């Protein structure tokens, strides 16, 4: 009736190297049996698993409001720049894997 995929914000996150970099992932779950995954695109335009919630430099924390999660790169390096998304693997109702639209992390020289 009003549906949204998992939100991954911001679409462009620009930090200096050594800074922490924190994306926000939003997923409105209609059940409790799901896991939330954080991914980075391989150069093959494919998908590698960085971290999940429930579960070292990539961490996912679940915020109090039951919707939002924080995926943070600790002390971002310059080879951290690339494509990122989150995805919501929910088994019921209807067993779906829902991926956010991609976001760019851009780590600029210090």
């Amino acid at each position, epitope marked *: *009736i009003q*549906w949204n995929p998992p939100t991954f914000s911001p679409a462009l996150l620009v930090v200096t190297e050594g800074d922490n970099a924190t994306f926000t992932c939003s997923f409105s779950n209609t059940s409790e049996s799901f896991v939330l995954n954080w991914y980075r695109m391989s150069p093959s335009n494919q998908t590698d698993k960085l971290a999940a919630f429930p579960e070292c430099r990539f961490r996912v924390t679940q915020l109090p409001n039951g919707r939002d999660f924080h995926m943070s790169v600790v002390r971002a390096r310059r080879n951290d720049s690339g494509t990122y998304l989150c995805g919501a*693997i929910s088994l*019921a*109702p*209807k*067993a*779906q894997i829902k991926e956010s639209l991609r976001a760019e992390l851009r780590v600029t020289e210090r």
Partner: antibody
Amino acid sequence: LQQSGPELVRPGVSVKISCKGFTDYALHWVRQSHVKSLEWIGVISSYNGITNYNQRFKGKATMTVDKSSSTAYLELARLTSEDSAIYYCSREEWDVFYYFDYWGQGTTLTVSS
Amino acid sequence: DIMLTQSPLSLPVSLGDQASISCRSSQGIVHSDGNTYLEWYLQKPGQSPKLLIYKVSNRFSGVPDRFSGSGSGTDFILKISRVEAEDLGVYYCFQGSHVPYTFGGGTKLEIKR
């Protein structure tokens, strides 16, 4: 899609039936009683073991998966003459729009003294 | 819980007549997706149920063109135009939009004579 053979056990004991296919689906258990009324028991994820149970069958049913063997288990505990039924396993693909394509043959379970 | 009540239990027909089985739910079955995951299954005696119609109207491939699913809101209809030796059995609707998933009570399609 190949389940354990038929079982005849006494009230109060437990039984474990098996369903053998793997990491691409959700696996469901559906029980069909002797009035031919189907009921959904639960779903298990082969690759995470995460579960969702019909609350009515929580505690009467426990779902477990072994991925090396590519086999799922339903354990029925504290058994009673109501659990006499045909127990089917069936699967559902992840990102498709339909549920049960292929079924197991079913495992007929009788509980009596 | 979504209880699915079907009418009638027995539908007598001549092979080639027009019979329609109806499925009614106690509340709306629209999933978070906007999709309505309602299905129709046909069960021949001694075998697993087989998927015929998924979503509301989609026929699964392999399924004959005469089985037409439709419906909306709280109301759904399975219609069979050409009714066959291979069509007799018990038809169940099913909703997969809200856990727990639930089946209708069944409708037995029989030969009138």
